Design a protein around this ligand. Sequence first.
Ligand code: A1H91
Ligand code: A1H91
Ligand code: ZN
Ligand code: ZN
Lengths: 261, 262
Amino acid sequence: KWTYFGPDGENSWSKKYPSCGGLLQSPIDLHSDILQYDASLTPLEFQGYNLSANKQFLLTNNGHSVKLNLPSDMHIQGLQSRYSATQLHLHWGNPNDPHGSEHTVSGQHFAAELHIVHYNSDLYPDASTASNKSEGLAVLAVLIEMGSFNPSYDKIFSHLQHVKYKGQEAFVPGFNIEELLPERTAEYYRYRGSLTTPPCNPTVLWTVFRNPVQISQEQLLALETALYCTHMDDPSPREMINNFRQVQKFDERLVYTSFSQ
Amino acid sequence: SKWTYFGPDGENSWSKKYPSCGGLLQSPIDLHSDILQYDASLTPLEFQGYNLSANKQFLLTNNGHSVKLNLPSDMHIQGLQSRYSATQLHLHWGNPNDPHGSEHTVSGQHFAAELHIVHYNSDLYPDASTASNKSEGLAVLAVLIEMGSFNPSYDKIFSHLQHVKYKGQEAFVPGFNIEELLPERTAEYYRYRGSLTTPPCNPTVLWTVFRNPVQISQEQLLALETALYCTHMDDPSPREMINNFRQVQKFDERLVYTSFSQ
Ligand SMILES: NS(=O)(=O)c1c(F)c(NCCCCO)c(S(=O)(=O)CCCO)c(NC2CCCCCCC2)c1F
Ligand SMILES: NS(=O)(=O)c1c(F)c(NCCCCO)c(S(=O)(=O)CCCO)c(NC2CCCCCCC2)c1F
Ligand SMILES: [Zn+2]
Ligand SMILES: [Zn+2]
C-alpha cells in the first residue's frame, strides 16, 4: 500500500499509519550541536553473528527493500535486555544521485545504509509483537560509502539477481554477519527513535556506528539497479531506488555518543 | 485542528487534509551537485517597481503561520515568459536555541532563515489566489539568510514585529526599496519547478533561489524568533511562531537549473 514515490509516498504514510505523523520519528541528521558524550555507552557484543555455513537464511524482495532473515539465537549483548535479531536490509539512492542513506551526518548522506533489526526477546516472544511495545526494538545502522570492493557485502549482493522482483526469494548460506560492521564498533551514536517505514512505531533504540564501511562502485551500482518493487508479471515495472525516508525534525533532543574525541 | 509545523498537525500529516502536500513537484529541496545543471538560457531577471515610496505604507500581517508584507501589483519581475506581479513577501526561520530555519538547503546545510517574495502571473490572472491553482501561476524568489552583520534593510520589516505579535494583527510599514533585501549577484540563481511549501502545497511555483545569501545579525534573528505567536492574543493555549520551515522533499527525477556554470 505504501511506497517511496508518487501518491503513496512518505508524506502520505500518516493517513494509514498514524505513528508516521507522531513523535520520535527517524531518521535524523546527526550533527555536532546535538551530540553529547555519554560514558554509559560501552561496547556492544555481537553474539551468534557467526551464522552456521551449514544453515541457509532466506533473502527476500518484499517490494520495499531486500531483506535477509536472521535467527533468534543471534543477539546483542550490552543493553538492559537481550535483543535478538530478526532481519537485515538496506536503503539506497539511484545511479544519478547515489546518496541514499537514511541518517545523515552534518547534513550529508552516505551512499547507502544497512539496518540489522533486533527485538526485545526478554520481554516479547517475537519481533511483530515487540514492534509496537515499550523497549521493543533495537536497530544497528551501518553507513556505506563507495570505495574498495567488500567481499563480505558480496555474500549478500551476489544473490540479488535471484530476488529481482517482489515476492522472489533466495537462500543465503550462513556467514559472519559481524563482517558487515565497520571498524571500531565501540564508536557509535545512540538515540530513541522509530521505524523508518510504516507503521513508523516509536519503539526503536538506534545505534548508528560512527565509521562507514566501503563497497565498490560496481557493488553500489548492482544494489541500485538489481531490484524492482513490482512483481515479475507487472506490465508497469518500477525500479527499487531511493528507498530511504527523508530526515525528520529533531528538536530539543540529544543524540548520545560513545566517543568524546 | 489547523495545520502547524509541530505535533499531530505537523508536516507529515498535512497530506491528510491537503492532498497536494503528498503529490508531485513538492518544495523545498536540497540543492546539491548531482541534481544541478547549468542552463545558459537563464538570463538575468529585472526587478521593476521594487523601489516602494517611503511616503506610502504597506500592510504587515501575522497570519498565524508567518509574518507577511503585502506588496503592490505595480511591482513585477521581467525576464520570465510572462510578467509576474508581486503579491507578498514573508519569512521562514528556526528558534533561539537553533537558528537554522531556511527551507531550501545547499549541499545539506540549512541557513538561518529564508525570505520568499511571492509573485503571480498578472498577464494571465487577476489575482494571486486565482493564479495559485494554475501551472506556472506563481513565481517565488527565495533569499537565503545567514547569521552575520546587522542588516538595516531587513530591519525595516523587523522593527515592526512587536506590533504583529499575534495572529490576525496588522501594522503598516513605510515603503522602502525591496531590492535591498536581495543578495549580491542576483544574476546567479537556481531555478526549478516546485510547489508552495505550505498547505495547500499547490505544484504551481516557478522557484528562483538566489545563489548568494544575505546576512542579518544574531540580534535580528533572536527578535524574529521570539516576537511572534501563531495564536490569537486571547488564546489560552499560546504557540510560539518558531521552526516554520518544511523539511526538504524528494526530488522525484527533477533537475535544478543554474544560471552559473561554476
Ligand atoms: N528501516 S527499519 O529498520 O525501520 C525497517 C524498515 F525499513 C522496513 N522496510 C524495509 C526497508 C524499505 C526500504 O529499504 C521494515 S519491513 O520491510 O518489514 C516493512 C513492511 C512490511 O510489510 C522493517 N521491519 C520492522 C517493522 C514492521 C513490522 C515487523 C516487525 C519489526 C521490524 C523495519 F524495521
Ligand atoms: N513558502 S511559499 O512561498 O510557498 C508560501 C507560504 F509559505 C505562505 N505561507 C507563509 C509561510 C508560513 C511559514 O513561514 C503563503 S500565505 O501565507 O499567503 C497562505 C497560506 C497559509 O500561510 C504563500 N502565498 C500563496 C498561497 C496560496 C493562495 C493565496 C495567494 C498567494 C500565494 C506562499 F507562497
Ligand atoms: Zn531500515
Ligand atoms: Zn515561504
